[PDB]
Design a protein around this ligand. Structure first.
Ligand SMILES: Nc1nc2c(ncn2[C@@H]2O[C@H](COP(=O)(O)OP(=O)(O)O)[C@@H](O)[C@H]2O)c(=O)[nH]1
Ligand SMILES: [Mg+2]
Lengths: 164, 184, 299
C-alpha cells in the first residue's frame, strides 16, 4: 500500500499525483498530522493515537480501527469504524456510516476544502447532493425508540476547530 | 406417494440451487451481487444483517444469500449452512494485513458438517488496484492446495467493471451439474 | 397455461381491498374471484414467481399502515395466506422482509391477536411465519432490547422471552397456527443466543408435556402433536453436537408415550420421524464418494 507508518511528531502530506485511484494504508501513528490533497480510492487508518488526518474525496470506503483521540475529515461512500473511543469525524457520506464497538463518537458535517477540491470531487464519481452524516447505524445498539449511546452529534459551538 | 409425484418433486427440487456468499467485511460481496444482477453500484450500503436475491441463469433458479462479514455476524453464519450447494468466498486483494485472519476464516468453513458436499468458488475481488495481490499470492497465502474434500477454483474479478464474473458462475453451475442430485 | 394473463384484473382486485372491507357484500365476491383466479396455477405455481414479489409489496404496504383498520389488515392476511398455499410458504416467506427494524413491529402485531377468533385465523397463521423470517438475522435479541429497566418497578420483557412464550402458547392450539409455531421453533430455539438461554427450559417443558398428556382426550393429543413437531424441527434444523446431549432423554420419553399402540396415525408418524432425527444425531453425516462418476444432475 502507499502510505506512512511507524512515525512520531511527523506532519506528512501528499499531492493528487501520488493519491489518484491508489489504495492508502496508515499504521502506528502518534501525534502526527497527515494532509492528502487528492482522491485516494480506499483509505485504512489503523492504530492511530492523537492524529489529525485531512484527506480529500475517497471514491469507495474509509476503514478505521484502534483509533482514539483522533480528528478525521474525509468524504467517501461508506465509513467503517471498529474499536474507536472519542474521535470526532467531519463526514460527507453518499451511502451510510456504521460503527462497531465504539463509544463517544461525535459526527459533524464536512467543511474542509482546498483550491483544487473541485477537480478532485469529479475524480471520486461521488454525488455532492448526498450527505447522510446524521444517520449512522450501530451494530451493538439496535433499538427502535432509544438512541445509540455510542455516537452523537457535535454541537455547533464545538465545530469551529482549528485546521492548522 | 407414487413414483410420478416423487419424480415430479425431484425434478422441481433439481431446478433450485443455493449459493451462499461469505467473506470478510469490506470485501465487495454486495457490490458483486449487484453487478451480477445489473443494478446500480453508486448506491450500495453495507448489509446490517443479510440480504437475499433470486434470479434465473441458464434455466437454473439461483438463490443468493449475501451475509455480512462483520465480527459479530460470523457467529451467526451457521444459520445459513442448511441446504447449501455452493459457497462463494470473496477475498479482498488489497486487504493484505488481515489476510491471516481471512485464511483462518475460510479454513474453519471447510471442516463443517452441512457444508461437506458443496462446490467452492473463491473470487479475488479488487484486482485492478495498485497493491492488489495476484491470484497465486492469494492461493499460497490461504493454502488452497491443502483443500481436498471440496472442489475449489480461484478466479480474480472486479465488480467495479464487471469482469470475470460470468465465468465463475458458469464454472460453479458446471461443477454442480457434474454430480448427481438426490432428494432426502 | 404459459404466463400470467390476468395481471390487470389481479392488480385491480388487490387495489380494491380498501373499499370492500367494511360491508361483506363486496368482500366475499372479491375473495371468491381471487381464489378462482389463483386456483388455475395450483399445478404450475412456478409461473407466478415473477408476480409474487410485487403482489407481496402491495399486500405488505396495507398491513404496515397504522391507519389500516383490523378488518382491512385481516383482509390483506387472507390474500397472503391464499398466495402462500398457492405458490408455497418455503418460496414465499423467503422474499418477505428480513431487516432488523422489522423485528419489533411484527412481534407487536402478534401480541394483539385473539386466539379465540376463528373469523381471522389467517391473520394469526401467516403472521407467525413472518416472525420466523425475522430470526434469520445475525444479531442477538439483547442488542435489540437495549435497556429493559427503563420503567419504575415493572420491568420490560425481552424479545426472546416474548417469542418463547408465544411459541409455547401456540404449539397447543387446534388451528393451523400451531404448525406455524413449529416453523418459529426451527428459527428461534436453533439461534446461537436463544439456544444458550432457551434450550434446557424448552426441552424440560416439552418432556413434561409429553409425560402428562393422554392420546384419549382431544387436548392432550394436540399438545403431544405440537411437542413432537417442535422436537422434530429442533432435531432437523438444529446442530448435532448441541442436540446429541439430549437424544437419549428424548428417545426414552418417546418410547414411554407408547405411541406404536395408539389408533392415532399422525402421532405414530411424528414419533417415527422424531425417532430417525434423534438417531441421525448419534452418527456424523457421510458424503457419497460415488458421485462425480455415475451420472449428471439432470437427464
Ligand atoms: N476498487 C474497488 N472497490 C470495490 C470493488 N468491489 C467493491 N468495492 C468497494 O468496496 C466497498 C465494500 O463493498 P461492499 O459491497 O459494501 O462489500 P461488503 O459489504 O463487504 O459485502 C464498497 O465501497 C465497494 O464500492 C472493486 O472491484 N474495486
Ligand atoms: Mg454487503
Amino acid at each position: 500500500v502507499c502510505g506512512f507508518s511507524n512515525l512520531e511528531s511527523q506532519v506528512l502530506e501528499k499531492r493528487a499525483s501520488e493519491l489518484h485511484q491508489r489504495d492508502v494504508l496508515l499504521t502506528e501513528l502518534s501525534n502526527c498530522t497527515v494532509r492528502l490533497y487528492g482522491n485516494p480510492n480506499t483509505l485504512r487508518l489503523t492504530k492511530a493515537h492523537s492524529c489529525k488526518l485531512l484527506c480529500g474525496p475517497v471514491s469507495t470506503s474509509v476503514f478505521l480501527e484502534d483509533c482514539s483521540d483522533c480528528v478525521l475529515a474525509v468524504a467517501c461512500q461508506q465509513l467503517r469504524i471498529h474499536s474507536t473511543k472519542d474521535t470526532r469525524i467531519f463526514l460527507q457520506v453518499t451511502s451510510r456510516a456504521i460503527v462497531e464497538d465504539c463509544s463517544g463518537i461525535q459526527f459533524a458535517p464536512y467543511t474542509w476544502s482546498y483550491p483544487e477540491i473541485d477537480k478532485d470531487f469529479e475524480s471520486s464519481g461521488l454525488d455532492r447532493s448526498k450527505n447522510n452524516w446524521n444517520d449512522v447505524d450501530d451494530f451493538n445498539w439496535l433499538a427502535r425508540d432509544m438512541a445509540s449511546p455510542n455516537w452523537s452529534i457535535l454541537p455547533e459551538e464545538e465545530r469551529n476547530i482549528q485546521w492548522d | 406417494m407414487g413414483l410420478l409425484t416423487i419424480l415430479k418433486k425431484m425434478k422441481q427440487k433439481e431446478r433450485e440451487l443455493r449459493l451462499l456468499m461469505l467473506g470478510l467485511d469490506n470485501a465487495g460481496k454486495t457490490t458483486i451481487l449487484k453487478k451480477f444482477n445489473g443494478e446500480d453500484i453508486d448506491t450500495i450500503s453495507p448489509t446490517l444483517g443479510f440480504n437475499i436475491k433470486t434470479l434465473e441463469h441458464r434455466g437454473f433458479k439461483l438463490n443468493i444469500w449475501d451475509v455480512g462479514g462483520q465480527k459479530s455476524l460470523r457467529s451467526y453464519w451457521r444459520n445459513y449452512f442448511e441446504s447449501t450447494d455452493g459457497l462463494i468466498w470473496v477475498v479482498d486483494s488489497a486487504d493484505r494485513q488481515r489476510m491471516q485472519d481471512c485464511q483462518r476464516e475460510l479454513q474453519s468453513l471447510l471442516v463443517e458438517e452441512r457444508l461437506a458436499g458443496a462446490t467452492l468458488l473463491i473470487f479475488a475481488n479488487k484486482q485492478d488496484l495498485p497493491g492488489a495481490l495476484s491470484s497465486n499470492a492469494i492461493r499460497e497465502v490461504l493454502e488452497l492446495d491443502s483443500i481436498r474434500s471440496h472442489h475449489w477454483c480461484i478466479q480474480g474479478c472486479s465488480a467495479v467493471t464487471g469482469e470475470n464474473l460470468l465465468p465463475g458462475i458458469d464454472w460453479l453451475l458446471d461443477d454442480i451439474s457434474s454430480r448427481i442430485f438426490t432428494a432426502d | 397455461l404459459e404466463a400470467f394473463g390476468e395481471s390487470a384484473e389481479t392488480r385491480a382486485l388487490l387495489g380494491r381491498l380498501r373499499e370492500v372491507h367494511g360491508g361483506g357484500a363486496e368482500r366475499e365476491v372479491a375473495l371468491e374471484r381471487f381464489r378462482v383466479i389463483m386456483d388455475k396455477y395450483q399445478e404450475q405455481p412456478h409461473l407466478l414467481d415473477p408476480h409474487l414479489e410485487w403482489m407481496m409489496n402491495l399486500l405488505l404496504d396495507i398491513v404496515q399502515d397504522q391507519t389500516s383498520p383490523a378488518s382491512l389488515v385481516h383482509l390483506a392476511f387472507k390474500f397472503l395466506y391464499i398466495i402462500t398455499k398457492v405458490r408455497g410458504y418455503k418460496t414465499f416467506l423467503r422474499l418477505f422482509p428480513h431487516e432488523v427494524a422489522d423485528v419489533e413491529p411484527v412481534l407487536d402485531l402478534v401480541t394483539i391477536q385473539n386466539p379465540k377468533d376463528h373469523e381471522a385465523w389467517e391473520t394469526r397463521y401467516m403472521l407467525l411465519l413472518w416472525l420466523s423470517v425475522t430470526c434469520l438475522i445475525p444479531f442477538d435479541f439483547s442488542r435489540l432490547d437495549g435497556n429493559l429497566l427503563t420503567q419504575p418497578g415493572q420491568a420490560r420483557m425481552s424479545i426472546m422471552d416474548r417469542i418463547l412464550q408465544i411459541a409455547e402458547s401456540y404449539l397447543i392450539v387446534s388451528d393451523k397456527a400451531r404448525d406455524a409455531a413449529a416453523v418459529l421453533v426451527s428459527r428461534f430455539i436453533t439461534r446461537p443466543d436463544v439456544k444458550q438461554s432457551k434450550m434446557a427450559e424448552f426441552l424440560d417443558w416439552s418432556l413434561c408435556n409429553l409425560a402428562r398428556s393422554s392420546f384419549q382426550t382431544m387436548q392432550g393429543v394436540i399438545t403431544m402433536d405440537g411437542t413432537l413437531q417442535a422436537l422434530a424441527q429442533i432435531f432437523k434444523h438444529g446442530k448435532r453436537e448441541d442436540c446429541l446431549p439430549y437424544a437419549a432423554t428424548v428417545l426414552r420419553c418417546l418410547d414411554g408415550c407408547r405411541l406404536p399402540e395408539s389408533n392415532q396415525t399422525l402421532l405414530r408418524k411424528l414419533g417415527v420421524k422424531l425417532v430417525q432425527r434423534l438417531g441421525l444425531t448419534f452418527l456424523k453425516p457421510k458424503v457419497a464418494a460415488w458421485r462425480y462418476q455415475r451420472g449428471c444432475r439432470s437427464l
